[PDB]
């Protein structure tokens, strides 16, 4: 071999140091984002059990006995009723003053700037299906003045990696369908399966 | 009077033979209660500490 | 190092780009699996409440008190009686005209394509034992007629992940073996037990 | 997860790094391709079936806006009949999806045309030409349907 | 990147494919246990009614009206009494010639080399507490003479996994206290408790 | 890469800078041997087994 030979050899180390890989920090936010499921689940079951034994659905997390473990990384909220969030800023829980229908993110273990303390989530591209005309008002709806409550409806808000944005779930008691958009996508969703308003790993800024 | 997992307070059930109304707060719900029904006055599941 | 080695890494690179792991699409098949199994016991637990209560099975779904929730991806059948399948393909679930013998495919949620309407599963591989002599034709056997009914026989019928053939599942109030085959396990199976008749993971084609 | 494949690459998850020099298409749905021409990305209008290449550091004249690869050379195989058009097939009205077909389009050193990718979800075989390998390709196998060092010019 | 990245790329996959998860089989054995916590404690009530109803307990489970279903994986011994222990070889149960205190395990469908047709279990490590001074040995003790009985012993025998020895089970009417070993936990057992004495997912061999 | 030898320069990626002196034979394979007589190099019919 020769110069050039050489020389080409060390462009081409030179070019395997900047190749451009795929993305993986989509696939580690992927990974992050099953918290939003579980716990959104889990939502669902303490409310079917709430409803079976008092024949009414719950606007707050202390009657439905529902809590995710520390290092969260999503806000939930149960309804858009009055209250605190239950704010996890400290590593003792605070005593609550009154019902709290939100769980605030657990930024003890996240830093102080990435504290969600209304973790409402979007609803735009959640449309409910069926004649009994639901809407998107978290929480029991119509209202908790009926017993035989229509089906209720709960969702979160977290981050995923570095996206300075938020991504948002919901889950509801009725069936609905999503709509397609830049940070959403389009199919029917039963009642009791999580969906993905926006989902922070497709886009970052205003796009919803 | 009990305790229910590591709680180190404790959760209170009464029954009467009367009708009540439940009031809300932090660790209770907000409903009537009929006669013979128990009625949770602290659950401890909701919370723990001077909470009541 | 020299060219032979950097294009040696190249190659490399080149290999494991297309490597051969595991099918992983298996394990996410049996994963799904596993409402097959869950929603058969529920059946049988509600014909043993409903004999208990009325000395007698039943051929309806009405009367047993048995409907999975939506997006069961597999259609159920407690009889071989008359009636429609109580198609699931709206939001709203129809009235019923009559009593219903079979649950159909969620297809609200899977598309319009992948119905199925009469979840009929495959029993050839599943020999009933014992003296009583019970045949394998599905419901209330050898006749309703029979208050001290001899046990019943039910059996689900859906597809798992893109096989294009379906697998099928049964569950006996009766002992059973299981017959060895292309798509199915060879050994005893206790009353109360789901049986996979075609499992659909080992095969997919003409295969039973 | 969702028992269906997707047509766009915002659903599915997947975008290259910057500096890719290869432009990316999941499928031939409608939608613009993510041009990639300044240092902050766009903010989406819908979703997106293509990534275009990455103009921002390899100039103006080298974007590629449509990166829709050359499929002459792929013959699918097996008795379900898969076609070459790229996305999910035979329509994504099918949850039980039949598999989907993906490709790229580049261009590799000073070579005037392009250079061409595909990957499918089912079996194929390349046909021998000027730029192109014969031979049999698995399924999740990428195959260079045209390859741009061996050619170029009209050469396919 | 050069061939030493690439080699210890390969390297690593080598290292993940032989990593050490934990023992989950362990976990299963865990969860297949629980078929004895729940069919002694259907034992202690069907005692307790047959008492009520008749002023004595029973040495047999003819009389008392226990038997678990079919795939049972465990034996269980409700006195010492001399009988058969109503073998589960076969499709049909046989047809019993006299009283029976013990059933044994279900090897219809578990083989024949798991059968277990003297489910006796070890009572080694359970301290009868109280000043009445009752026994350890199975059945109705002291004896079933006296019509106002005390308190009865009961247990279970059975194999967890592929342990090739047994854990065991027992139920009493009166209260005791477990005596710490390598196979058995230490602390008070209130009457109506089943204790484990072997619990076999701890151990396997001659550990007692 | 492939788990197989070529037959053809093509698909090896092999190629010598022009004024070779010297003409390079991969395969005694059919097909032409890509003549390099004028400024632009000839456009391929197909895979060629040999170098003029």
Same mark, same amino acid.
Request: aromatic residues 10%.
């Given at each position: 071999?020769?110069?050039?030979?050489?020389?080409?050899? &060390?462009?081409?180390?030179?070019?395997?140091?900047?190749?451009?890989?795929? %993305? !993986?920090?989509? !696939?580690?936010?992927?990974?992050?984002?099953? =918290?939003?499921?579980?716990?959104?689940?889990?939502? $669902?079951?303490?409310?079917?059990?709430?409803?079976?034994?008092?024949?009414?659905? +719950?606007? #707050?997390?202390?009657?439905?006995?529902?809590?995710?473990?520390?290092?969260?990384? $999503?806000? $939930?909220?149960? +309804?858009?009723?009055?209250? *605190?969030?239950?704010?996890? %800023?400290?590593?003792?829980?605070?005593?609550?003053?009154?019902? &709290?229908?939100?769980?605030?993110?657990?930024? !003890? /273990?996240?830093?102080?700037?990435?504290?969600?303390?209304?973790?409402?989530?979007?609803?735009? /591209? #959640?449309?409910?299906?069926?004649?009994?005309? @639901?809407?998107?008002?978290?929480?029991?709806?119509?209202?908790?003045?009926?017993?035989?409550?229509? %089906?209720?409806?709960?969702?979160?808000?977290?981050?995923?990696?570095? =996206?300075?944005?938020? *991504?948002? @779930?919901?889950?509801?008691? #009725?069936?609905?369908?999503?709509?397609?958009?830049?940070?959403?996508?389009?199919?029917? &969703?039963?009642?009791?399966?999580?969906?993905?308003?926006?989902? *922070?790993?497709?886009?970052?800024?205003?796009?919803?």
């Amino acid at each position: 071999f020769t110069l050039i030979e050489l020389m080409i050899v &060390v462009a081409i180390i030179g070019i395997l140091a900047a190749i451009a890989i795929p %993305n !993986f920090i989509k !696939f580690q936010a992927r990974s992050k984002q099953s =918290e939003a499921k579980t716990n959104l689940k889990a939502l $669902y079951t303490a409310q079917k059990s709430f409803f079976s034994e008092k024949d009414r659905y +719950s606007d #707050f997390a202390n009657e439905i006995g529902f809590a995710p473990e520390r290092g969260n990384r $999503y806000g $939930y909220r149960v +309804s858009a009723a009055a209250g *605190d969030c239950e704010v996890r %800023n400290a590593a003792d829980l605070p005593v609550p003053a009154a019902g &709290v229908p939100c769980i605030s993110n657990d930024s !003890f /273990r996240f830093g102080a700037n990435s504290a969600i303390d209304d973790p409402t989530p979007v609803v735009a /591209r #959640f449309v409910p299906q069926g004649a009994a005309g @639901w809407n998107t008002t978290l929480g029991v709806q119509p209202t908790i003045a009926d017993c035989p409550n229509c %089906n209720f409806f709960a969702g979160a808000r977290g981050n995923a990696d570095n =996206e300075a944005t938020f *991504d948002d @779930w919901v889950i509801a008691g #009725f069936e609905g369908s999503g709509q397609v958009g830049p940070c959403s996508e389009a199919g029917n &969703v039963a009642s009791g399966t999580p969906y993905n308003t926006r989902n *922070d790993v497709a886009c970052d800024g205003a796009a919803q």
